[PDB]
Amino acid sequence: HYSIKEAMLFSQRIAQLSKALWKSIEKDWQRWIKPFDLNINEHHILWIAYHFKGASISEIAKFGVMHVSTAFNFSKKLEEKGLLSFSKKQDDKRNTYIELTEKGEEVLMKLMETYDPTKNAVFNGALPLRELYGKFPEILEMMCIVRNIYGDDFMEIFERAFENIKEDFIEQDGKLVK
Amino acid sequence: HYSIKEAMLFSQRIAQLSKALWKSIEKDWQRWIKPFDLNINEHHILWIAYHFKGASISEIAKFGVMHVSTAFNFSKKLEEKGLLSFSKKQDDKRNTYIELTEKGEEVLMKLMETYDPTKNAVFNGALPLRELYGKFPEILEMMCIVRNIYGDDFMEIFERAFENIKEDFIEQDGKLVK
Amino acid sequence: HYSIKEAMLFSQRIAQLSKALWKSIEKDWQRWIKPFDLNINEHHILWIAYHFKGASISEIAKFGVMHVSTAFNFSKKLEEKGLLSFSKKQDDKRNTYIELTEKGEEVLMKLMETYDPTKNAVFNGALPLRELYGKFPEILEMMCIVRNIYGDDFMEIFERAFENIKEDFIEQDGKLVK
Amino acid sequence: HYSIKEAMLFSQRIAQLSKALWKSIEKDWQRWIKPFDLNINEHHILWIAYHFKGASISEIAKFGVMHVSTAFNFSKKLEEKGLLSFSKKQDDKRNTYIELTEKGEEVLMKLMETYDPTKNAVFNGALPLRELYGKFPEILEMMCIVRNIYGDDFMEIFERAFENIKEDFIEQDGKLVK
DNA sequence: AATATTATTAACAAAATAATATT
DNA sequence: AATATTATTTTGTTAATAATATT
DNA sequence: AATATTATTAAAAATAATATT
DNA sequence: AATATATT
DNA sequence: AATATTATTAACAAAATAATATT
DNA sequence: AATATTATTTTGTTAATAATATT
C-alpha cells in the first residue's frame, strides 16, 4: 500500500507538469488561430466535426474536453459566421446534430497550410529525444492514465487522426495538400 | 530529418493528451480549495512562498506558470486578507518582495490536513501502473520536454518540494503533522 | 560526473539481468532445435543466410554474435551436410561468400512449422505488459545500449527481419507458411 | 488476441538483443577476473555468499543462474583453494551450507580495487541516456519480464546489494574501501 | 424521472496601458 | 543609449448554474 | 413521448318501471 | 293499449 | 625498390548440464 | 528431497596459410 507522503509527492509532480505543458501549448495554439477570429475551443469544434460527422453537442463536448454549455454557445456562434450546419432527427428531437459547411472545410484546409512546427515550443523541447529514439516520443504512461480516466471510446480520436492523415492528404513542396 | 506528416501526428497527439490531463487536474484542485475562498493561482502563490522565501513577483510568476499581472493583482488581494506581506529593498526600489504571514502558514497546513488522494481521478488512474512497477510512475519524457521549455532553475521546485516534505512534516495517525 | 558507487550499482543490475534473460532463452531455443542435430549458432547462421544473401564469414559472425573461427568452422560442417554452398568472387579472392541450398531452406521452413509461443517462458513473461500497453514491449533502452555498442550497421538485421517476415509469410491453420 | 506473426516478431527481437548484451558482459567479466584464477560462475558464488551468508547449494543455484550440479562442483573446487567452507545442521542433515573464509573475503576485496567502469563497454553505452535523464537507466520492462520468470525471492538479490554497498563500503582516493 | 439542451450570471486570468526607478 | 519592474486599468474565454422543451 | 395500473369520480344495448299517451 | 389520473 | 594489412583456414583448450548413484 | 558421483559435449581461444594495390 502507499504512505501519504508518496501520494502527496506524486500529485505535486503531475500537477505542475500538466500545468506547464498545457500553458505552452495554449500560447502557441492561440498565436496560430488569432487570424480568422477563432478561439481555441472553436477550432477544436471544427476539427472534431471533420473527423466525426453528425456528432451530438454532448459527443462534441466529450471529445473536445470542454463543458457542454461551452460547446452549445460556440457552435451557435459558428453558425453565425456560416461555418457549420445544425440538424435534427425525427426519431428523437431532443438531440441536436452538427455538420460542417464548405467554408469550414476551406478554413481548416487553408489553416493546415500555415502550420510551421518549428515555432511551437513543445516540438522543439521534444526534438532531443526524437534522434535518440529515432522516432518521435510516445508518452505511453500519460496514454495509460488518460485511457483510464476517459475510457476506450475517447481514445478512438487518435486512431482516426492517423487514419485520416494517411489516404486523405499528401505531401508536396514543403507543405501538405489534399 | 522529420517529415511534415510526422510532426503533425506528434503535435495533435501531445495536444489532446495535455488538454485531457490538465482539465481533470484543474477540476479536482478547485473543489478541494473552494471552502477557503482561494482560487487555483492564489494557492500556487502561497505554496511558492512557503518553498521559496523572499521571492520577487516575477520569480513567482516564473515558478507559478502565470503572467506577471495576475501575480501582482492576486498578491495584492492576499495582502488584504493578511496571508502575505510585501517588502522592498535598497539595492533597487523597483523590485517588490513577498513573504508569508503566520496566518498563511496556518492556511497551507490546514489544506494539507484536508487531503484525500482517492478523490483525485489522476491518482486512481495511476494506481494500475504502480502495481506493475512497484512505484508511482515518473514520466521521464514529459520531465525532459519540460526542462527544455522552462530551464533547470525552474526545476529546483521539485527538489525543494521533496526535501521540505521530508523534514518538517512527520507521518502519524494516517495524517501529517510537524 | 558520477560517483563510483552508482557505477557499481548499475553494473550489478545489468549483469544479473543479462544472465537471466540469456540463460532462459538459451534453454528453450536448444529444446526447439534439438531434433535436427543443430547447435544454436548453426541455426543462427542459417537464418542470417536467409535474410542477408551473399554474405561473408565476417558478416555472418558480426550479425550472429561469434568469432570468425566459430562461423567458418561451423559453416564447413553445414556445407558437408548439404545445407549451404560456398562461393568465391573474381575480385578479392580472399573473401568466401555463403548461400543457402534448397535442403537448408527445407529445414528452416519445417522448423517454423513447429514454433509454439507458449512454451517460451520469456513469451509468457511479457503478456502482463502487452495487456496494459496494448502492444508488445519495445525496450528502447536496451536497444539503445546494443546499438551504441555494435553500431547502426549491425542493427540493420532487425529491420530486415521485420520486413522479410511480414511479406513472405502468411498464417494457415494457425501455423506460418510461405 | 495475438497473431503468431506478432509472437515471432517479438521472439526474434528479444533473442538477438539478449544474446548481444550477454556476449559483451561475458567478454569483460572474464578479463576482470582472469588474473585471479577464477571463472565467471565461481566469482558469482563468492559474491552470493557475501550477501546471503548461510545458504544451500540449491539456493546459490537459484540466485546465480545455474544448475545444482554446477554449484556443488564449483564450490568443492573453491573449498580446495581454501576460499569457502562447508557446514551441516542437525535438524535436517541432507542439506549442505556454505560460508566465506577470510581468503575469499580477500579476493573479493582485492578485486573491488581493480574496478574501472570506463573499460567495460555497457557502461559506455549507457552514458548518453544518463546525460539526458540525469540518472542511470532502470530498464523497468526487463525487470518485469525477469520477475515474471524468476519469482520475487530471486529479486531480493538486488535489494541486498543496494543496501550493503551503501553501508559497508566508503568512497575515497577515487576508489571504494571499507 | 430522466434526457437532451438552451438561455443567462459570475469569475478567472491575461492583454494592453501608466508610471516610478537603476545608472 | 533607452530599459526594467512594477502597478494601474483596459478584455474575452469558458463554465456554473437556472429555465425549457422533448422522450 | 412512452409506459401503466391502482382508484376517484367522473362521465353501449337491453330491460324494466312508471308515466303520460 | 300506447306513450314517455399516475410514474419513469 | 620500398611499404602494410587484410580475410580466411587449421588446431587446441575449455565448460555445463545430463544423466547417475547414495543419507 | 537434497545432495554427492560420474558421463557428454559447443562455444570460443590461439597457430598457419594465402590474397591486393599504393607511396
Coordinates of N, CA, C and O in Angstrom, one line a residue, chain A residues 3-151:
Chain A
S3 N 2.2 5.1 1.5 CA 2.2 6.1 2.5 C 1.6 7.4 2.0 O 1.5 7.6 0.8
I4 N 1.1 8.3 2.9 CA 0.6 9.6 2.5 C 1.6 10.4 1.7 O 1.4 11.0 0.7
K5 N 2.9 10.3 2.2 CA 4.0 11.1 1.6 C 4.1 10.7 0.1 O 4.2 11.7 -0.7
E6 N 4.1 9.5 -0.3 CA 4.2 9.1 -1.7 C 3.1 9.6 -2.5 O 3.3 10.2 -3.6
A7 N 1.9 9.6 -2.1 CA 0.7 10.1 -2.8 C 0.9 11.6 -3.0 O 0.7 12.2 -4.1
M8 N 1.3 12.3 -1.9 CA 1.5 13.8 -2.0 C 2.5 14.1 -3.0 O 2.4 15.1 -3.8
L9 N 3.6 13.4 -3.0 CA 4.7 13.8 -3.9 C 4.4 13.5 -5.4 O 4.7 14.3 -6.3
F10 N 3.6 12.4 -5.6 CA 3.2 12.1 -7.0 C 2.3 13.2 -7.5 O 2.4 13.7 -8.6
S11 N 1.3 13.6 -6.7 CA 0.4 14.6 -7.1 C 1.1 16.0 -7.3 O 0.7 16.7 -8.3
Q12 N 2.0 16.4 -6.5 CA 2.6 17.7 -6.8 C 3.4 17.6 -8.1 O 3.4 18.5 -8.9
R13 N 4.1 16.4 -8.4 CA 4.8 16.4 -9.7 C 3.9 16.5 -10.9 O 4.0 17.3 -11.8
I14 N 2.8 15.7 -10.8 CA 1.9 15.6 -12.0 C 1.1 16.8 -12.1 O 0.8 17.3 -13.3
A15 N 0.7 17.4 -11.0 CA 0.1 18.7 -11.1 C 0.9 19.8 -11.8 O 0.4 20.3 -12.9
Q16 N 2.1 20.1 -11.4 CA 3.0 21.1 -12.0 C 3.3 20.7 -13.5 O 3.3 21.6 -14.4
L17 N 3.6 19.4 -13.8 CA 3.9 19.0 -15.2 C 2.7 19.3 -16.1 O 2.9 19.9 -17.2
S18 N 1.5 18.8 -15.7 CA 0.4 19.1 -16.6 C 0.2 20.6 -16.8 O 0.0 21.0 -18.0
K19 N 0.4 21.4 -15.8 CA 0.1 22.8 -15.9 C 1.1 23.4 -16.9 O 0.7 24.2 -17.8
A20 N 2.4 23.2 -16.7 CA 3.4 23.7 -17.6 C 3.2 23.3 -19.0 O 3.2 24.2 -19.9
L21 N 3.1 22.1 -19.3 CA 2.9 21.6 -20.7 C 1.7 22.3 -21.3 O 1.8 22.9 -22.5
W22 N 0.5 22.3 -20.7 CA -0.7 22.9 -21.2 C -0.5 24.4 -21.5 O -1.1 24.9 -22.4
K23 N 0.2 25.1 -20.6 CA 0.3 26.6 -20.8 C 1.1 26.8 -22.1 O 0.7 27.7 -22.9
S24 N 2.2 26.1 -22.4 CA 2.9 26.4 -23.6 C 2.1 26.1 -24.8 O 2.1 26.9 -25.8
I25 N 1.5 24.9 -24.8 CA 0.5 24.5 -25.9 C -0.5 25.6 -26.1 O -0.8 26.0 -27.3
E26 N -1.1 26.2 -25.1 CA -2.1 27.3 -25.2 C -1.5 28.5 -26.0 O -2.1 28.8 -27.0
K27 N -0.5 29.1 -25.4 CA 0.1 30.2 -26.1 C 0.3 30.0 -27.6 O -0.1 30.8 -28.5
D28 N 0.9 28.8 -28.0 CA 1.2 28.6 -29.4 C 0.0 28.5 -30.3 O -0.1 29.1 -31.3
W29 N -1.0 27.7 -29.8 CA -2.2 27.5 -30.4 C -2.9 28.8 -30.7 O -3.5 29.0 -31.8
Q30 N -2.9 29.7 -29.7 CA -3.6 31.0 -29.9 C -2.9 31.9 -30.9 O -3.6 32.5 -31.7
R31 N -1.6 32.0 -30.9 CA -0.9 32.8 -32.0 C -1.4 32.2 -33.3 O -1.7 33.0 -34.2
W32 N -1.4 30.9 -33.5 CA -1.7 30.4 -34.8 C -3.1 30.8 -35.2 O -3.3 31.4 -36.3
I33 N -4.1 30.6 -34.3 CA -5.5 30.8 -34.7 C -6.0 32.3 -34.4 O -7.2 32.5 -34.5
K34 N -5.2 33.2 -34.1 CA -5.6 34.6 -33.9 C -6.1 35.3 -35.2 O -7.1 36.0 -35.1
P35 N -5.4 35.2 -36.3 CA -6.1 35.4 -37.6 C -7.3 34.5 -37.6 O -7.5 33.5 -36.8
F36 N -8.3 34.8 -38.5 CA -9.5 34.1 -38.7 C -10.5 34.3 -37.5 O -11.7 33.8 -37.6
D37 N -10.1 35.1 -36.5 CA -11.0 35.4 -35.4 C -11.7 34.1 -34.8 O -12.9 33.9 -34.8
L38 N -10.8 33.2 -34.2 CA -11.3 31.9 -33.7 C -10.7 31.8 -32.3 O -9.5 32.1 -32.1
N39 N -11.5 31.3 -31.4 CA -11.0 30.8 -30.1 C -10.6 29.3 -30.1 O -11.1 28.6 -31.0
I40 N -9.8 28.9 -29.2 CA -9.2 27.6 -29.2 C -10.3 26.5 -29.2 O -10.2 25.5 -29.9
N41 N -11.3 26.7 -28.4 CA -12.4 25.8 -28.4 C -13.2 25.8 -29.7 O -13.7 24.7 -30.1
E42 N -13.2 26.9 -30.4 CA -13.9 27.0 -31.7 C -13.2 26.1 -32.7 O -13.8 25.2 -33.4
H43 N -11.9 26.3 -32.9 CA -11.1 25.4 -33.7 C -11.2 24.0 -33.3 O -11.4 23.1 -34.2
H44 N -11.1 23.7 -32.0 CA -11.3 22.3 -31.6 C -12.6 21.7 -32.2 O -12.7 20.6 -32.6
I45 N -13.7 22.6 -32.2 CA -15.0 22.1 -32.6 C -15.0 21.7 -34.0 O -15.6 20.7 -34.5
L46 N -14.5 22.6 -34.9 CA -14.5 22.3 -36.3 C -13.7 21.0 -36.5 O -14.1 20.1 -37.3
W47 N -12.5 20.8 -35.9 CA -11.7 19.7 -36.1 C -12.4 18.4 -35.8 O -12.5 17.4 -36.6
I48 N -13.1 18.4 -34.6 CA -13.9 17.2 -34.3 C -14.9 16.9 -35.4 O -15.1 15.8 -35.8
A49 N -15.6 18.0 -35.9 CA -16.6 17.7 -36.9 C -16.0 17.1 -38.2 O -16.7 16.3 -38.8
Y50 N -14.8 17.5 -38.5 CA -14.2 16.9 -39.7 C -14.0 15.4 -39.5 O -14.5 14.6 -40.3
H51 N -13.5 15.0 -38.3 CA -13.2 13.6 -38.2 C -14.5 12.8 -37.8 O -14.5 11.6 -38.1
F52 N -15.5 13.4 -37.2 CA -16.7 12.7 -36.9 C -17.9 13.5 -37.5 O -18.1 14.6 -37.1
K53 N -18.6 12.9 -38.3 CA -19.7 13.6 -39.0 C -21.1 13.2 -38.4 O -21.4 12.0 -38.2
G54 N -21.9 14.2 -38.1 CA -23.2 14.1 -37.5 C -23.2 14.0 -36.0 O -24.2 13.6 -35.4
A55 N -22.1 14.3 -35.3 CA -22.0 14.2 -33.9 C -23.0 15.1 -33.2 O -23.5 16.1 -33.7
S56 N -23.3 14.7 -31.9 CA -24.1 15.4 -31.0 C -23.3 16.5 -30.3 O -22.0 16.4 -30.3
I57 N -23.9 17.6 -29.8 CA -23.2 18.6 -29.0 C -22.5 17.9 -27.8 O -21.3 18.2 -27.5
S58 N -23.2 16.9 -27.1 CA -22.6 16.3 -26.0 C -21.4 15.4 -26.4 O -20.4 15.3 -25.6
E59 N -21.6 14.6 -27.4 CA -20.5 13.9 -28.0 C -19.3 14.8 -28.3 O -18.1 14.5 -28.0
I60 N -19.6 16.0 -28.9 CA -18.6 17.0 -29.1 C -17.9 17.3 -27.8 O -16.7 17.1 -27.7
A61 N -18.6 17.7 -26.8 CA -18.0 18.0 -25.5 C -17.1 16.9 -25.1 O -16.0 17.2 -24.6
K62 N -17.5 15.6 -25.2 CA -16.7 14.5 -24.8 C -15.3 14.5 -25.4 O -14.3 14.5 -24.8
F63 N -15.3 14.6 -26.8 CA -14.0 14.6 -27.4 C -13.2 15.8 -27.2 O -12.1 15.8 -26.7
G64 N -13.9 17.0 -27.3 CA -13.3 18.3 -27.2 C -12.9 18.8 -25.8 O -12.6 20.0 -25.7
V65 N -12.8 17.9 -24.8 CA -12.5 18.2 -23.4 C -13.0 19.6 -23.0 O -12.2 20.4 -22.5
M66 N -14.2 19.9 -23.3 CA -14.9 21.1 -22.8 C -16.3 20.8 -22.3 O -16.8 19.7 -22.4
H67 N -16.9 21.7 -21.6 CA -18.2 21.6 -21.0 C -19.3 21.7 -22.1 O -19.1 22.2 -23.1
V68 N -20.4 21.1 -21.8 CA -21.4 21.0 -22.8 C -21.9 22.4 -23.2 O -22.1 22.8 -24.3
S69 N -22.1 23.3 -22.2 CA -22.6 24.6 -22.4 C -21.7 25.4 -23.3 O -22.1 26.1 -24.2
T70 N -20.4 25.3 -23.1 CA -19.4 26.0 -23.9 C -19.5 25.6 -25.4 O -19.4 26.4 -26.3
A71 N -19.7 24.3 -25.6 CA -19.9 23.7 -26.9 C -21.2 24.3 -27.6 O -21.2 24.7 -28.7
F72 N -22.3 24.4 -26.8 CA -23.5 24.9 -27.4 C -23.3 26.4 -27.8 O -23.6 26.7 -29.0
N73 N -22.9 27.2 -26.9 CA -22.7 28.6 -27.2 C -21.8 28.8 -28.4 O -22.0 29.7 -29.3
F74 N -20.6 28.1 -28.4 CA -19.7 28.4 -29.5 C -20.1 27.8 -30.9 O -19.9 28.4 -31.9
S75 N -20.9 26.7 -30.9 CA -21.3 26.2 -32.2 C -22.4 27.1 -32.8 O -22.5 27.3 -34.0
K76 N -23.3 27.7 -31.9 CA -24.2 28.7 -32.4 C -23.4 29.9 -33.1 O -23.6 30.2 -34.2
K77 N -22.4 30.4 -32.3 CA -21.6 31.5 -32.9 C -21.0 31.0 -34.3 O -20.8 31.8 -35.2
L78 N -20.7 29.7 -34.4 CA -20.1 29.2 -35.6 C -21.1 29.1 -36.8 O -20.8 29.2 -37.9
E79 N -22.4 29.0 -36.4 CA -23.4 29.1 -37.5 C -23.6 30.5 -37.9 O -24.0 30.8 -39.0
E80 N -23.3 31.5 -37.0 CA -23.5 32.9 -37.4 C -22.5 33.3 -38.5 O -22.9 33.8 -39.5
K81 N -21.2 32.9 -38.4 CA -20.3 33.1 -39.4 C -20.4 32.2 -40.6 O -19.7 32.3 -41.6
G82 N -21.3 31.2 -40.5 CA -21.6 30.3 -41.6 C -20.5 29.3 -41.9 O -20.0 29.2 -43.0
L83 N -20.1 28.6 -40.8 CA -19.1 27.5 -40.9 C -19.7 26.1 -40.6 O -18.9 25.2 -40.8
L84 N -20.9 26.0 -40.0 CA -21.4 24.8 -39.5 C -22.9 24.7 -39.8 O -23.6 25.7 -39.8
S85 N -23.4 23.5 -40.0 CA -24.8 23.2 -40.3 C -25.4 22.4 -39.2 O -25.1 21.3 -39.0
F86 N -26.4 23.0 -38.5 CA -27.2 22.3 -37.5 C -28.3 21.4 -38.2 O -28.7 21.6 -39.3
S87 N -28.7 20.4 -37.4 CA -29.7 19.5 -37.9 C -30.4 18.7 -36.7 O -29.9 18.8 -35.6
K88 N -31.5 18.1 -37.0 CA -32.3 17.3 -36.0 C -32.9 16.1 -36.7 O -33.0 16.0 -37.9
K89 N -33.2 15.1 -35.9 CA -33.7 13.8 -36.4 C -35.1 13.5 -35.9 O -35.4 13.9 -34.7
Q90 N -35.9 12.9 -36.7 CA -37.3 12.7 -36.4 C -37.5 11.8 -35.2 O -38.3 12.1 -34.4
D91 N -36.7 10.7 -35.2 CA -37.0 9.7 -34.1 C -37.0 10.3 -32.7 O -37.9 10.1 -31.9
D92 N -35.9 11.1 -32.4 CA -35.9 11.9 -31.2 C -35.4 13.3 -31.5 O -34.3 13.5 -32.1
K93 N -36.2 14.3 -31.0 CA -36.0 15.7 -31.3 C -35.1 16.4 -30.2 O -34.8 17.6 -30.4
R94 N -34.9 15.8 -29.1 CA -34.1 16.4 -28.0 C -32.6 16.7 -28.5 O -32.2 17.8 -28.3
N95 N -32.0 15.7 -29.1 CA -30.6 15.9 -29.5 C -30.5 16.7 -30.8 O -31.3 16.6 -31.7
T96 N -29.4 17.5 -30.9 CA -29.1 18.4 -32.0 C -27.8 17.9 -32.6 O -26.8 17.6 -31.9
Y97 N -27.7 18.0 -33.9 CA -26.6 17.4 -34.7 C -25.9 18.5 -35.4 O -26.4 19.5 -35.8
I98 N -24.6 18.2 -35.7 CA -23.7 19.3 -36.3 C -22.9 18.7 -37.4 O -22.4 17.5 -37.3
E99 N -22.8 19.4 -38.5 CA -22.1 19.0 -39.7 C -21.3 20.2 -40.2 O -21.5 21.3 -39.7
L100 N -20.4 20.1 -41.1 CA -19.5 21.1 -41.5 C -19.8 21.7 -42.9 O -19.9 21.0 -43.8
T101 N -19.9 23.0 -42.9 CA -20.2 23.7 -44.2 C -18.9 23.7 -45.1 O -17.8 23.4 -44.6
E102 N -19.0 24.0 -46.3 CA -17.9 24.1 -47.3 C -16.9 25.1 -46.9 O -15.7 24.9 -46.9
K103 N -17.4 26.3 -46.4 CA -16.4 27.3 -45.9 C -15.6 26.8 -44.7 O -14.5 27.2 -44.5
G104 N -16.2 25.9 -43.9 CA -15.5 25.3 -42.8 C -14.3 24.5 -43.3 O -13.2 24.6 -42.8
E105 N -14.6 23.6 -44.3 CA -13.5 22.8 -44.9 C -12.5 23.7 -45.5 O -11.3 23.4 -45.5
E106 N -12.9 24.9 -46.0 CA -11.9 25.8 -46.5 C -11.0 26.4 -45.4 O -9.8 26.5 -45.6
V107 N -11.7 26.7 -44.3 CA -10.9 27.3 -43.2 C -9.9 26.3 -42.7 O -8.6 26.5 -42.7
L108 N -10.3 25.1 -42.4 CA -9.5 24.0 -41.8 C -8.3 23.8 -42.8 O -7.2 23.7 -42.4
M109 N -8.6 23.6 -44.1 CA -7.6 23.2 -45.0 C -6.6 24.3 -45.2 O -5.4 24.0 -45.1
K110 N -7.0 25.5 -45.4 CA -6.1 26.7 -45.5 C -5.2 26.7 -44.3 O -4.0 27.1 -44.4
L111 N -5.8 26.5 -43.1 CA -5.1 26.6 -41.9 C -3.9 25.6 -41.8 O -2.8 26.0 -41.5
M112 N -4.2 24.4 -42.1 CA -3.1 23.3 -42.3 C -1.9 23.8 -43.1 O -0.8 23.5 -42.8
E113 N -2.2 24.6 -44.1 CA -1.0 25.2 -44.9 C -0.1 26.0 -44.0 O 1.1 25.9 -44.1
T114 N -0.7 26.8 -43.1 CA 0.1 27.7 -42.3 C 0.8 27.1 -41.1 O 1.6 27.8 -40.4
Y115 N 0.6 25.8 -40.9 CA 1.3 25.1 -39.8 C 2.8 25.1 -40.0 O 3.3 24.6 -41.0
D116 N 3.6 25.8 -39.1 CA 5.0 25.7 -39.1 C 5.5 25.1 -37.7 O 5.6 25.8 -36.7
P117 N 5.7 23.8 -37.7 CA 6.1 23.1 -36.4 C 7.2 23.9 -35.7 O 7.2 23.9 -34.4
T118 N 8.1 24.5 -36.3 CA 9.3 25.0 -35.6 C 9.0 26.0 -34.6 O 9.6 26.1 -33.6
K119 N 8.0 26.9 -34.9 CA 7.6 27.9 -34.0 C 7.1 27.4 -32.6 O 7.4 28.0 -31.6
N120 N 6.3 26.3 -32.6 CA 5.8 25.7 -31.4 C 6.9 25.3 -30.5 O 7.9 24.8 -30.9
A121 N 6.7 25.5 -29.2 CA 7.7 25.4 -28.2 C 8.0 23.9 -27.8 O 9.1 23.5 -27.6
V122 N 6.9 23.1 -27.7 CA 7.0 21.7 -27.3 C 7.7 20.9 -28.3 O 8.5 20.0 -28.0
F123 N 7.4 21.2 -29.6 CA 8.1 20.4 -30.7 C 9.6 20.5 -30.5 O 10.3 19.5 -30.4
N124 N 10.1 21.7 -30.2 CA 11.5 22.0 -30.1 C 12.1 21.4 -28.8 O 13.2 20.9 -28.8
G125 N 11.3 21.4 -27.7 CA 11.8 20.8 -26.5 C 11.7 19.3 -26.4 O 12.2 18.7 -25.5
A126 N 11.1 18.7 -27.4 CA 11.0 17.3 -27.6 C 11.9 16.7 -28.7 O 12.0 15.5 -28.8
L127 N 12.5 17.6 -29.5 CA 13.3 17.1 -30.6 C 14.6 16.4 -30.1 O 15.0 15.4 -30.8
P128 N 15.2 16.7 -29.0 CA 16.3 15.8 -28.5 C 15.9 14.3 -28.5 O 16.7 13.5 -29.0
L129 N 14.8 14.0 -27.9 CA 14.5 12.5 -27.8 C 14.2 11.9 -29.1 O 14.2 10.7 -29.2
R130 N 13.9 12.7 -30.1 CA 13.5 12.1 -31.4 C 14.7 11.4 -32.1 O 14.5 10.4 -32.7
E131 N 15.8 12.0 -32.0 CA 17.0 11.4 -32.6 C 17.5 10.2 -31.7 O 17.9 9.2 -32.3
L132 N 17.6 10.4 -30.4 CA 18.0 9.3 -29.5 C 17.1 8.1 -29.8 O 17.6 7.0 -29.8
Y133 N 15.8 8.3 -30.0 CA 15.0 7.1 -30.2 C 14.7 6.9 -31.7 O 13.9 6.0 -32.1
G134 N 15.3 7.7 -32.6 CA 14.9 7.6 -34.0 C 13.5 7.8 -34.4 O 13.2 8.0 -35.6
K135 N 12.6 7.9 -33.4 CA 11.2 8.1 -33.6 C 10.7 9.2 -32.6 O 11.4 9.5 -31.7
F136 N 9.6 9.9 -32.9 CA 9.1 10.9 -32.0 C 8.6 10.3 -30.7 O 8.1 9.1 -30.8
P137 N 8.7 10.9 -29.6 CA 8.3 10.3 -28.3 C 6.8 10.0 -28.2 O 5.9 10.9 -28.6
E138 N 6.5 8.8 -27.7 CA 5.1 8.3 -27.4 C 5.0 8.2 -25.9 O 5.7 7.4 -25.3
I139 N 4.2 9.1 -25.3 CA 4.2 9.1 -23.8 C 3.2 8.0 -23.4 O 2.0 8.3 -23.2
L140 N 3.6 6.8 -23.3 CA 2.7 5.7 -23.0 C 2.1 5.9 -21.7 O 0.9 5.6 -21.5
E141 N 2.9 6.4 -20.7 CA 2.4 6.5 -19.3 C 1.2 7.5 -19.2 O 0.2 7.2 -18.6
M142 N 1.4 8.7 -19.8 CA 0.2 9.5 -20.0 C -0.9 8.7 -20.7 O -2.1 8.8 -20.3
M143 N -0.6 8.1 -21.9 CA -1.7 7.5 -22.6 C -2.4 6.5 -21.7 O -3.7 6.3 -21.8
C144 N -1.7 5.9 -20.7 CA -2.4 4.9 -19.8 C -3.3 5.5 -18.8 O -4.5 5.2 -18.7
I145 N -2.8 6.5 -18.1 CA -3.7 7.3 -17.2 C -4.9 7.7 -18.0 O -6.0 7.3 -17.7
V146 N -4.7 8.5 -19.1 CA -5.8 9.2 -19.8 C -6.8 8.2 -20.3 O -8.0 8.5 -20.3
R147 N -6.3 7.0 -20.8 CA -7.3 6.0 -21.2 C -8.2 5.6 -20.0 O -9.4 5.3 -20.2
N148 N -7.6 5.4 -18.8 CA -8.3 5.0 -17.6 C -9.4 6.1 -17.3 O -10.5 5.8 -17.1
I149 N -8.9 7.3 -17.2 CA -9.8 8.4 -16.8 C -11.0 8.5 -17.8 O -12.1 8.5 -17.4
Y150 N -10.7 8.5 -19.1 CA -11.6 8.9 -20.1 C -12.2 7.7 -20.9 O -13.1 7.9 -21.7
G151 N -11.8 6.5 -20.7 CA -12.3 5.3 -21.4 C -11.9 5.1 -22.8 O -11.1 5.8 -23.4

